[PDB]
Short mmCIF file of C-alpha atoms and ligand atoms in Angstrom, two decimals:
data_model
loop_
_atom_site.label_atom_id
_atom_site.label_comp_id
_atom_site.label_asym_id
_atom_site.label_seq_id
_atom_site.Cartn_x
_atom_site.Cartn_y
_atom_site.Cartn_z
CA UNK A 1 -45.40 165.36 -237.97
CA UNK A 2 -48.90 164.37 -236.87
CA UNK A 3 -51.70 166.89 -237.30
CA UNK A 4 -54.83 166.84 -235.11
CA UNK A 5 -57.29 164.98 -237.33
CA UNK A 6 -61.05 165.50 -237.62
CA UNK A 7 -61.90 162.93 -234.96
CA UNK A 8 -59.03 164.15 -232.77
CA UNK A 9 -60.08 167.77 -233.31
CA UNK A 10 -58.08 169.82 -230.83
CA UNK A 11 -59.31 172.98 -229.12
CA UNK A 12 -56.02 174.46 -227.91
CA UNK A 13 -52.81 176.05 -229.15
CA UNK A 14 -50.34 173.38 -230.22
CA UNK A 15 -47.95 172.73 -233.13
CA UNK A 16 -48.17 169.72 -235.47
CA UNK A 17 -44.42 169.10 -235.09
CA UNK A 18 -43.21 166.80 -232.31
CA UNK A 19 -39.62 166.47 -231.09
CA UNK A 20 -39.11 162.80 -230.26
CA UNK A 21 -36.42 160.18 -229.59
CA UNK A 22 -34.99 158.25 -232.55
CA UNK A 23 -34.54 154.61 -231.50
CA UNK A 24 -34.06 152.44 -234.59
CA UNK A 25 -33.26 149.03 -233.04
CA UNK A 26 -34.40 146.80 -230.19
CA UNK A 27 -34.01 143.36 -228.71
CA UNK A 28 -36.83 140.88 -228.50
CA UNK A 29 -37.51 139.92 -224.90
CA UNK A 30 -38.33 136.61 -223.21
CA UNK A 31 -39.98 136.19 -219.82
CA UNK A 32 -37.52 133.60 -218.51
CA UNK A 33 -34.83 133.25 -215.82
CA UNK A 34 -31.09 133.86 -216.01
CA UNK A 35 -29.99 131.21 -213.49
CA UNK A 36 -30.51 127.46 -213.53
CA UNK A 37 -33.72 126.18 -211.90
CA UNK A 38 -33.14 122.70 -210.53
CA UNK A 39 -30.07 122.18 -212.69
CA UNK A 40 -32.03 122.99 -215.84
CA UNK A 41 -32.28 126.21 -217.82
CA UNK A 42 -35.43 127.59 -219.39
CA UNK A 43 -35.47 128.05 -223.16
CA UNK A 44 -37.93 128.80 -225.96
CA UNK A 45 -37.97 126.27 -228.81
CA UNK A 46 -39.99 126.68 -232.04
CA UNK A 47 -42.85 124.29 -232.67
CA UNK A 48 -43.83 125.48 -236.20
CA UNK A 49 -42.06 127.43 -238.91
CA UNK B 1 -21.86 170.19 -265.65
CA UNK B 2 -23.86 171.58 -268.56
CA UNK B 3 -24.96 174.60 -266.49
CA UNK B 4 -21.33 175.80 -266.29
CA UNK B 5 -21.46 176.95 -269.92
CA UNK B 6 -23.63 179.92 -268.93
CA UNK B 7 -21.52 181.30 -266.08
CA UNK B 8 -19.49 184.44 -266.70
CA UNK B 9 -16.59 183.69 -264.29
CA UNK B 10 -15.68 187.37 -264.14
CA UNK B 11 -15.90 188.11 -267.86
CA UNK B 12 -18.53 190.28 -269.53
CA UNK B 13 -20.47 187.47 -271.21
CA UNK B 14 -20.64 183.70 -271.26
CA UNK B 15 -21.11 183.65 -275.03
CA UNK B 16 -17.89 183.39 -277.02
CA UNK B 17 -19.55 184.93 -280.07
CA UNK B 18 -20.48 188.13 -278.24
CA UNK B 19 -16.94 188.47 -276.94
CA UNK B 20 -15.51 187.85 -280.40
CA UNK B 21 -17.88 190.38 -282.01
CA UNK B 22 -17.74 193.30 -279.57
CA UNK B 23 -14.08 193.75 -278.57
CA UNK B 24 -10.65 194.21 -280.10
CA UNK B 25 -8.57 191.01 -280.47
CA UNK B 26 -5.97 192.10 -277.85
CA UNK B 27 -8.89 193.10 -275.62
CA UNK B 28 -10.79 189.86 -276.25
CA UNK B 29 -8.12 187.37 -275.08
CA UNK B 30 -8.36 188.74 -271.53
CA UNK B 31 -12.06 187.95 -271.44
CA UNK B 32 -11.69 184.58 -273.18
CA UNK B 33 -9.02 183.44 -270.71
CA UNK B 34 -11.43 183.85 -267.79
CA UNK B 35 -13.99 181.60 -269.49
CA UNK B 36 -11.26 179.07 -270.28
CA UNK B 37 -10.03 178.99 -266.68
CA UNK B 38 -13.54 178.62 -265.28
CA UNK B 39 -14.51 175.81 -267.63
CA UNK B 40 -11.27 173.92 -267.02
CA UNK B 41 -11.73 174.24 -263.24
CA UNK B 42 -15.24 172.79 -263.65
CA UNK B 43 -13.94 169.85 -265.69
CA UNK B 44 -11.18 169.09 -263.17
CA UNK B 45 -13.73 169.04 -260.32
CA UNK B 46 -15.96 166.67 -262.30
CA UNK B 47 -13.06 164.34 -263.09
CA UNK B 48 -12.04 164.19 -259.41
CA UNK B 49 -15.59 163.24 -258.42
CA UNK B 50 -15.67 160.43 -261.00
CA UNK C 1 -2.61 129.84 -220.77
CA UNK C 2 -4.92 132.43 -222.35
CA UNK C 3 -3.43 135.63 -223.79
CA UNK C 4 -5.46 138.78 -224.44
CA UNK C 5 -4.88 141.64 -226.86
CA UNK C 6 -7.08 144.40 -228.24
CA UNK C 7 -7.33 146.08 -231.61
CA UNK C 8 -9.00 149.32 -232.67
CA UNK C 9 -10.96 149.83 -235.90
CA UNK C 10 -12.25 153.29 -236.87
CA UNK C 11 -15.69 153.35 -238.51
CA UNK C 12 -16.58 157.07 -238.78
CA UNK C 13 -15.22 160.61 -238.78
CA UNK C 14 -16.49 164.06 -237.72
CA UNK C 15 -19.22 165.50 -239.95
CA UNK C 16 -17.93 168.84 -241.18
CA UNK C 17 -20.33 171.28 -242.81
CA UNK C 18 -19.21 174.42 -244.62
CA UNK C 19 -21.32 177.46 -245.46
CA UNK C 20 -19.60 178.33 -248.72
CA UNK C 21 -20.61 181.94 -249.32
CA UNK C 22 -19.98 182.93 -245.68
CA UNK C 23 -16.49 181.49 -245.96
CA UNK C 24 -15.77 183.27 -249.24
CA UNK C 25 -17.74 186.50 -249.00
CA UNK C 26 -18.70 186.70 -245.33
CA UNK C 27 -20.90 189.78 -244.96
CA UNK C 28 -20.22 192.18 -247.84
CA UNK C 29 -22.77 192.58 -250.62
CA UNK C 30 -20.22 193.61 -253.26
CA UNK C 31 -18.54 190.25 -252.74
CA UNK C 32 -21.89 188.45 -252.89
CA UNK C 33 -22.77 190.12 -256.19
CA UNK C 34 -19.35 189.15 -257.53
CA UNK C 35 -19.68 185.56 -256.28
CA UNK C 36 -23.11 185.20 -257.90
CA UNK C 37 -21.44 184.81 -261.33
CA UNK C 38 -19.46 181.75 -260.31
CA UNK C 39 -22.88 180.25 -259.92
CA UNK C 40 -22.97 176.59 -259.02
CA UNK C 41 -19.67 176.48 -257.23
CA UNK C 42 -21.02 176.71 -253.70
CA UNK C 43 -23.84 174.32 -254.51
CA UNK C 44 -21.44 171.60 -255.62
CA UNK C 45 -19.43 172.04 -252.42
CA UNK C 46 -22.60 171.76 -250.34
CA UNK C 47 -23.83 168.73 -252.28
CA UNK C 48 -20.53 166.85 -251.97
CA UNK C 49 -20.29 167.46 -248.23
CA UNK C 50 -23.95 166.46 -247.88
CA UNK C 51 -23.41 163.18 -249.70
CA UNK C 52 -20.35 162.47 -247.52
CA UNK C 53 -22.43 163.04 -244.38
CA UNK C 54 -25.10 160.73 -245.83
CA UNK C 55 -22.54 157.95 -246.30
CA UNK C 56 -21.36 158.46 -242.71
CA UNK C 57 -24.96 158.04 -241.48
CA UNK C 58 -25.43 154.84 -243.51
CA UNK C 59 -22.32 153.19 -242.08
CA UNK C 60 -23.33 154.16 -238.53
CA UNK C 61 -26.76 152.56 -238.97
CA UNK C 62 -25.17 149.41 -240.42
CA UNK C 63 -22.84 148.99 -237.45
CA UNK C 64 -25.82 149.52 -235.11
CA UNK C 65 -27.84 146.95 -237.08
CA UNK C 66 -25.15 144.23 -237.04
CA UNK C 67 -24.80 144.29 -233.24
CA UNK C 68 -28.56 143.74 -232.86
CA UNK C 69 -29.47 141.14 -235.49
CA UNK C 70 -30.92 138.15 -233.63
CA UNK C 71 -30.19 138.90 -229.99
CA UNK C 72 -32.94 137.79 -227.64
CA UNK C 73 -32.69 138.84 -224.02
CA UNK C 74 -34.30 137.78 -220.77
CA UNK C 75 -36.73 140.43 -219.60
CA UNK C 76 -35.71 139.69 -215.99
CA UNK C 77 -32.07 140.69 -216.45
CA UNK C 78 -30.34 143.19 -214.18
CA UNK C 79 -26.72 144.18 -214.72
CA UNK C 80 -26.36 145.20 -211.06
CA UNK C 81 -27.13 141.57 -210.14
CA UNK C 82 -25.97 139.58 -213.18
CA UNK C 83 -22.45 140.57 -214.22
CA UNK C 84 -20.71 137.25 -213.68
CA UNK C 85 -20.84 133.69 -215.08
CA UNK C 86 -18.59 130.67 -214.38
CA UNK C 87 -16.22 132.92 -212.35
CA UNK C 88 -15.37 135.13 -215.34
CA UNK C 89 -15.87 138.82 -214.59
CA UNK C 90 -17.94 141.00 -216.96
CA UNK C 91 -18.31 144.13 -214.82
CA UNK C 92 -16.04 146.27 -217.00
CA UNK C 93 -17.79 145.31 -220.23
CA UNK C 94 -21.44 146.02 -219.45
CA UNK C 95 -23.16 149.37 -219.25
CA UNK C 96 -26.71 149.65 -217.96
CA UNK C 97 -29.59 147.33 -218.78
CA UNK C 98 -32.66 145.91 -217.12
CA UNK C 99 -35.64 147.88 -215.85
CA UNK C 100 -34.40 150.27 -213.15
CA UNK D 1 -19.17 173.56 -238.08
CA UNK D 2 -19.15 169.94 -236.94
CA UNK D 3 -22.61 168.31 -236.84
CA UNK D 4 -23.39 165.54 -234.32
CA UNK D 5 -24.01 162.02 -235.69
CA UNK D 6 -27.49 160.57 -235.91
CA UNK D 7 -27.14 158.11 -233.04
CA UNK D 8 -25.77 158.97 -229.64
CA UNK D 9 -22.67 157.33 -228.29
CA UNK D 10 -24.74 156.05 -225.38
CA UNK D 11 -26.90 154.22 -227.90
CA UNK D 12 -23.88 152.40 -229.30
CA UNK D 13 -22.89 151.75 -225.69
CA UNK D 14 -26.25 150.05 -225.27
CA UNK D 15 -25.73 148.02 -228.41
CA UNK D 16 -22.33 146.72 -227.31
CA UNK D 17 -23.85 145.97 -223.88
CA UNK D 18 -26.58 143.87 -225.47
CA UNK D 19 -24.12 142.04 -227.72
CA UNK D 20 -21.89 141.28 -224.72
CA UNK D 21 -24.76 140.08 -222.53
CA UNK D 22 -26.12 137.90 -225.35
CA UNK D 23 -23.32 135.39 -224.69
CA UNK D 24 -23.60 135.05 -220.91
CA UNK D 25 -27.19 134.17 -219.99
CA UNK D 26 -30.01 132.08 -221.51
CA UNK D 27 -30.64 131.59 -224.41
CA UNK D 28 -26.93 132.24 -225.12
CA UNK D 29 -27.29 133.63 -228.64
CA UNK D 30 -23.90 135.26 -229.23
CA UNK D 31 -22.38 132.20 -227.51
CA UNK D 32 -24.02 130.25 -230.40
CA UNK D 33 -26.58 128.19 -228.52
CA UNK D 34 -24.54 126.66 -225.72
CA UNK D 35 -23.35 128.23 -222.42
CA UNK D 36 -20.24 130.34 -222.22
CA UNK D 37 -17.43 128.19 -220.80
CA UNK D 38 -18.98 125.23 -222.59
CA UNK D 39 -18.32 127.19 -225.79
CA UNK D 40 -14.78 128.06 -224.64
CA UNK D 41 -14.06 124.37 -224.01
CA UNK D 42 -15.40 123.41 -227.44
CA UNK D 43 -13.26 126.14 -229.02
CA UNK D 44 -10.05 124.98 -227.32
CA UNK D 45 -11.04 121.40 -228.18
CA UNK D 46 -11.16 122.15 -231.89
CA UNK D 47 -7.46 123.17 -231.93
CA UNK D 48 -5.97 119.88 -230.72
CA UNK D 49 -6.70 119.81 -226.99
CA UNK D 50 -8.27 116.82 -225.23
CA UNK D 51 -11.59 117.37 -223.47
CA UNK D 52 -10.18 115.62 -220.38
CA UNK D 53 -7.78 118.41 -219.40
CA UNK D 54 -10.37 121.05 -220.26
CA UNK D 55 -12.66 119.38 -217.74
CA UNK D 56 -9.69 119.12 -215.37
CA UNK D 57 -8.11 122.59 -215.61
CA UNK D 58 -11.29 124.65 -215.74
CA UNK D 59 -10.71 127.14 -212.94
CA UNK D 60 -7.15 127.78 -214.12
CA UNK D 61 -8.53 128.62 -217.57
CA UNK D 62 -11.10 131.00 -216.05
CA UNK D 63 -8.46 132.65 -213.84
CA UNK D 64 -6.23 133.26 -216.87
CA UNK D 65 -9.31 134.65 -218.65
CA UNK D 66 -9.87 137.20 -215.86
CA UNK D 67 -6.17 138.04 -215.81
CA UNK D 68 -6.08 138.73 -219.55
CA UNK D 69 -9.17 140.96 -219.30
CA UNK D 70 -7.70 142.90 -216.37
CA UNK D 71 -4.34 143.45 -218.03
CA UNK D 72 -6.23 144.70 -221.11
CA UNK D 73 -8.06 147.15 -218.83
CA UNK D 74 -4.91 148.41 -217.06
CA UNK D 75 -2.88 149.12 -220.19
CA UNK D 76 -4.03 152.44 -221.64
CA UNK D 77 -0.80 154.19 -220.64
CA UNK D 78 0.85 156.45 -223.24
CA UNK D 79 2.14 153.66 -225.51
CA UNK D 80 -1.08 151.83 -226.37
CA UNK D 81 -1.35 151.63 -230.14
CA UNK D 82 -5.14 151.79 -229.97
CA UNK D 83 -4.99 155.16 -228.20
CA UNK D 84 -2.54 156.42 -230.81
CA UNK D 85 -4.96 155.31 -233.53
CA UNK D 86 -7.80 157.15 -231.80
CA UNK D 87 -5.74 160.30 -231.29
CA UNK D 88 -4.62 160.33 -234.93
CA UNK D 89 -8.25 160.80 -236.02
CA UNK D 90 -8.77 163.80 -233.74
CA UNK D 91 -5.44 165.45 -234.53
CA UNK D 92 -5.99 164.98 -238.27
CA UNK D 93 -9.43 166.61 -238.16
CA UNK D 94 -8.22 169.54 -236.03
CA UNK D 95 -5.24 170.18 -238.31
CA UNK D 96 -7.37 170.12 -241.47
CA UNK D 97 -9.90 172.59 -240.06
CA UNK D 98 -7.26 174.98 -238.72
CA UNK D 99 -5.38 174.92 -242.01
CA UNK E 1 -30.38 138.82 -254.88
CA UNK E 2 -33.20 136.87 -253.24
CA UNK E 3 -32.49 135.48 -249.76
CA UNK E 4 -34.58 132.70 -248.20
CA UNK E 5 -34.49 132.06 -244.48
CA UNK E 6 -35.85 129.82 -241.75
CA UNK E 7 -38.45 131.57 -239.65
CA UNK E 8 -40.23 130.26 -236.53
CA UNK E 9 -43.95 130.87 -236.09
CA UNK E 10 -44.73 129.37 -232.65
CA UNK E 11 -42.74 128.71 -229.49
CA UNK E 12 -42.83 126.58 -226.38
CA UNK E 13 -41.01 126.92 -223.08
CA UNK E 14 -38.98 123.87 -222.10
CA UNK E 15 -36.35 123.00 -219.52
CA UNK E 16 -33.03 121.85 -220.94
CA UNK E 17 -29.71 120.50 -219.77
CA UNK E 18 -26.53 120.97 -221.82
CA UNK E 19 -24.82 117.70 -220.83
CA UNK E 20 -24.91 114.43 -218.88
CA UNK E 21 -22.33 112.75 -216.63
CA UNK E 22 -22.74 109.00 -217.15
CA UNK E 23 -21.82 105.95 -215.10
CA UNK E 24 -18.14 105.17 -215.02
CA UNK E 25 -17.16 108.87 -215.06
CA UNK E 26 -18.14 109.37 -218.68
CA UNK E 27 -19.86 112.34 -220.27
CA UNK E 28 -22.06 113.11 -223.22
CA UNK E 29 -22.87 116.48 -224.79
CA UNK E 30 -25.52 117.07 -227.47
CA UNK E 31 -24.89 118.08 -231.08
CA UNK E 32 -26.99 121.03 -232.32
CA UNK E 33 -29.58 120.37 -229.67
CA UNK E 34 -30.39 120.00 -226.02
CA UNK E 35 -30.99 117.23 -223.47
CA UNK E 36 -34.57 117.43 -222.21
CA UNK E 37 -36.69 115.30 -219.87
CA UNK E 38 -39.72 113.63 -221.43
CA UNK E 39 -41.81 111.24 -219.27
CA UNK E 40 -38.90 110.83 -216.81
CA UNK E 41 -36.64 109.71 -219.66
CA UNK E 42 -33.62 111.71 -220.82
CA UNK E 43 -34.28 112.66 -224.45
CA UNK E 44 -32.65 114.84 -227.12
CA UNK E 45 -34.32 117.67 -229.00
CA UNK E 46 -33.02 119.76 -231.90
CA UNK E 47 -32.40 123.42 -231.18
CA UNK E 48 -34.54 124.86 -234.00
CA UNK E 49 -37.60 122.63 -233.56
CA UNK E 50 -39.21 120.74 -230.69
CA UNK E 51 -39.04 116.99 -231.39
CA UNK E 52 -37.75 114.63 -228.67
CA UNK E 53 -35.96 111.51 -229.81
CA UNK E 54 -33.80 108.64 -228.49
CA UNK E 55 -30.33 109.54 -227.27
CA UNK E 56 -28.11 107.69 -229.75
CA UNK E 57 -24.45 108.20 -230.56
CA UNK E 58 -25.43 110.39 -233.51
CA UNK E 59 -26.94 113.06 -231.25
CA UNK E 60 -24.04 113.17 -228.78
CA UNK E 61 -20.32 113.71 -228.52
CA UNK E 62 -18.58 111.42 -226.02
CA UNK E 63 -16.01 112.44 -223.42
CA UNK E 64 -13.99 110.17 -221.14
CA UNK E 65 -14.45 112.70 -218.34
CA UNK E 66 -17.25 115.06 -217.43
CA UNK E 67 -17.63 118.73 -216.52
CA UNK E 68 -18.64 119.71 -213.02
CA UNK E 69 -22.16 121.00 -213.80
CA UNK E 70 -23.50 118.19 -215.96
CA UNK E 71 -26.73 116.49 -214.92
CA UNK E 72 -26.61 113.07 -213.28
CA UNK E 73 -27.88 110.09 -215.27
CA UNK E 74 -27.09 106.61 -213.92
CA UNK E 75 -30.02 104.99 -215.75
CA UNK E 76 -28.66 106.05 -219.17
CA UNK E 77 -26.67 103.44 -221.07
CA UNK E 78 -29.30 103.77 -223.78
CA UNK E 79 -29.14 103.44 -227.59
C1 NAG F 1 -38.41 147.82 -230.98
O1 NAG F 1 -37.86 148.35 -232.20
C2 NAG F 1 -38.43 147.70 -233.34
C3 NAG F 1 -37.62 148.10 -234.54
O2 NAG F 1 -38.09 147.44 -235.71
C4 NAG F 1 -39.91 148.07 -233.44
O3 NAG F 1 -40.47 147.42 -234.57
C5 NAG F 1 -40.64 147.65 -232.16
O4 NAG F 1 -41.96 148.17 -232.18
C6 NAG F 1 -39.91 148.15 -230.91
N1 NAG F 1 -40.49 147.57 -229.71
C7 NAG F 1 -40.63 148.23 -228.56
C8 NAG F 1 -41.23 147.46 -227.42
O5 NAG F 1 -40.28 149.40 -228.44
C1 NAG F 2 -44.35 136.85 -217.47
O1 NAG F 2 -44.19 138.23 -217.12
C2 NAG F 2 -45.13 138.70 -216.14
C3 NAG F 2 -44.88 140.18 -215.98
O2 NAG F 2 -44.28 140.73 -217.14
C4 NAG F 2 -44.95 137.92 -214.84
O3 NAG F 2 -45.93 138.34 -213.90
C5 NAG F 2 -45.10 136.42 -215.11
O4 NAG F 2 -44.80 135.69 -213.92
C6 NAG F 2 -44.16 135.97 -216.23
N1 NAG F 2 -44.37 134.57 -216.55
C7 NAG F 2 -43.46 133.62 -216.34
C8 NAG F 2 -43.86 132.23 -216.74
O5 NAG F 2 -42.36 133.86 -215.84
C1 NAG F 3 -48.17 125.42 -238.55
O1 NAG F 3 -49.12 126.48 -238.82
C2 NAG F 3 -49.97 126.27 -239.97
C3 NAG F 3 -50.84 127.50 -240.09
O2 NAG F 3 -50.98 128.16 -238.84
C4 NAG F 3 -50.77 124.98 -239.79
O3 NAG F 3 -51.55 124.74 -240.96
C5 NAG F 3 -49.82 123.82 -239.55
O4 NAG F 3 -50.54 122.61 -239.35
C6 NAG F 3 -48.93 124.10 -238.35
N1 NAG F 3 -48.01 122.99 -238.13
C7 NAG F 3 -48.19 122.08 -237.17
C8 NAG F 3 -47.17 120.99 -237.10
O5 NAG F 3 -49.14 122.14 -236.39
C1 NAG F 4 -21.93 125.26 -211.47
O1 NAG F 4 -23.27 125.55 -211.07
C2 NAG F 4 -23.37 126.12 -209.76
C3 NAG F 4 -24.84 126.24 -209.45
O2 NAG F 4 -25.56 126.78 -210.56
C4 NAG F 4 -22.63 127.46 -209.73
O3 NAG F 4 -22.63 127.93 -208.38
C5 NAG F 4 -21.20 127.31 -210.21
O4 NAG F 4 -20.59 128.59 -210.37
C6 NAG F 4 -21.13 126.56 -211.55
N1 NAG F 4 -19.74 126.31 -211.91
C7 NAG F 4 -19.31 126.20 -213.17
C8 NAG F 4 -17.85 125.94 -213.34
O5 NAG F 4 -20.08 126.28 -214.13
#
């Protein structure tokens, strides 16, 4: 449920109910490679905690 | 569970005093037995849930 | 050598709902008037089956949460290209994943 | 009536796909930090096996790994106990609703 | 119940090796960490924090063979 608010004041004929996809869980993604680059793999190591 | 003491269960009243003060004693047991069966069925269902 | 064997564990069941008065007194108003003095008998049946279906939903979300706690993936993965490591075959275990 | 569950079965397919691929590629999370056959060697090492022969019989170990997986795949034939345990669930539900 | 947990707040991308094949057909693997390359020296870092350090015999496990995809280190007979 999300009504058209006063700033987002709509001028048409639409319902405030929206039928969406329920997706409760994810994976975090990294921008790295899956194969070894020059014998060495890429990895992400914390540097503060 | 408390709201089951005001159901009729097929009898003419849920009050035992009105059944015992408006009918003949051989004609009252038939109405009292319906209340007894309904209340015991309610208690058995509660005990199963617990 | 290395021996393999599988087990199965069941974690849910079908979610049965019952409309109580349509099972007891399907369409006839004499039956509905007679059933309306048993009172909260259909409401208890509905509430018990509703709480059972709630428990089924909670266990399904817990199984889905446990498989996903702390898994970080490469955003350049592609199961059509990467289904194999160290000459051990993972084609039969993976579904679809990647970006296409 | 029988209501559908709140998640699809393709969503739980995606969750088992992610948990299987988490132990095959960097950063090897379900493999617990280290690469896959590294982790297999460390596992067989902790039972009483020398790391020499695990470095020496590596492709035989991986061949037996593939063979075990394939025989698992080709064994859903009328006497699998897992299939009996799946069919018991369905037959039990159908019998209760018909009765 | 109150549960306390480790939680990173910043990351850095590094290149790691999981093991070294040393001179005389020996091998070393790290313990709870990775072999990195700092200033053209093989170093060891922990796997939950970035801190390179000397490769001692408290950061490694020794093997009298080596696996076929270890990284080559002839200069390493170090501490
Ligand atoms: C992934 O799902 C998580 C669930 O907590 C949500 O917080 C996050 O916004 C989602 N990310 C994307 C990219 O959809
Ligand atoms: C990060 O991702 C973007 C696109 O998502 C890509 O163009 C870029 O090369 C990536 N960076 C690295 C270091 O791989
Ligand atoms: C970690 O972050 C906090 C706040 O951002 C900062 O005060 C602290 O110095 C950081 N640690 C290091 C080692 O830089
Ligand atoms: C060793 O690494 C090479 C190159 O990355 C690869 O082709 C090969 O499959 C690997 N073998 C093993 C046993 O890890």
